[PDB]
Amino acid sequence: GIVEQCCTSICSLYQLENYCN
Amino acid sequence: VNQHLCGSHLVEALYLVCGERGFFYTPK
Numbered sequence: 001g002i003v004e005q006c007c008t009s010i011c012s013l014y015q016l017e018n019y020c021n
Numbered sequence: 022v023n024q025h026l027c028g029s030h031l032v033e034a035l036y037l038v039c040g041e042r043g044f045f046y047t048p049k
């Protein structure tokens with residue numbers, strides 16, 4: 001998930017917007 | 022790579038990025 005994707009490697013604001021509601 | 026320490030940074034960044042739309046945080 002986002003832990004998998006954003007903790008090993010740095011997610012941008014762009015990538016993180018994907019998890020919004 | 023501590024998901025727990027990392028997780029708390031992520032919930033804070035999702036609060037800024039998502040703002041008003043909100044989000045679900047399932048640690049999943």
Ligand SMILES: [Cl-]
Binds near residue numbers: 026027
């Ligand atoms: Cl930390």
Ligand SMILES: [Zn+2]
Binds near residue numbers: 026027030
């Ligand atoms: Zn920290």
